[PDB]
């Protein structure tokens, strides 16, 4: 599968999975396991939202093409064959970014990397629903991270200090 292999335009109704798909593309070489589950979350969320409008069914079909392609590429990778190994992989990576961004936050260092790490950590917790229900701790870290990210971002956007 090509780097940045294009899907058809994203249906307006799937606007809520836009950033999960972007995260997938950004990890397509760095970490195909993350890229795979990010797409899986987007597929599975898309189906629940609208799987009968034609545009959406087209989009979903193309997305499954990339999933199937990537499952092929990954083969006997344990993070794919064993869900819980995939879950631990994503969870450890989400926590890594969260602890990174949190450390920056506590030091008063506010910048694009710490903002993106907060928001990606929350996107990864979304993705972790494909392994089962979120824990109370997942839910709190997700909310916390989304808040810091959009808040710090909007401050800096408007020349204010958070």
């Amino acid at each position: 599968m090509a780097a940045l292999a294009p899907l058809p335009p994203l249906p307006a109704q799937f606007k809520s999975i836009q950033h999960h798909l972007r995260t997938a593309q950004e990890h397509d070489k760095r970490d195909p396991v993350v890229a795979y589950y990010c797409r899986l979350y987007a597929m599975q969320t898309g189906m629940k939202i609208d799987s009968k409008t034609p545009e959406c069914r087209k989009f979903l079909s193309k997305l499954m093409d990339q999933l199937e392609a990537l499952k092929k590429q990954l083969g006997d990778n344990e993070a794919i064959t064993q869900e819980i190994v995939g879950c631990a992989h994503l969870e450890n990576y989400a926590l890594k970014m969260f602890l990174y961004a949190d450390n920056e936050d506590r030091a008063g260092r506010f910048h694009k990397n710490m903002i993106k790490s907060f928001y990606t950590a929350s996107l990864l917790i979304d993705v972790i629903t494909v392994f089962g229900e979120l824990t109370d701790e997942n839910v709190k870290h997700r909310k916390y991270a989304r808040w810091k990210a959009t808040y710090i971002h909007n401050c800096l956007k408007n020349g204010e200090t958070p």
Partner: peptide, 13 residues
Amino acid sequence: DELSQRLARLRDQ
């Protein structure tokens, strides 16, 4: 539903 089955096959079940 063609989709639903590809998903089930994707997730090895």
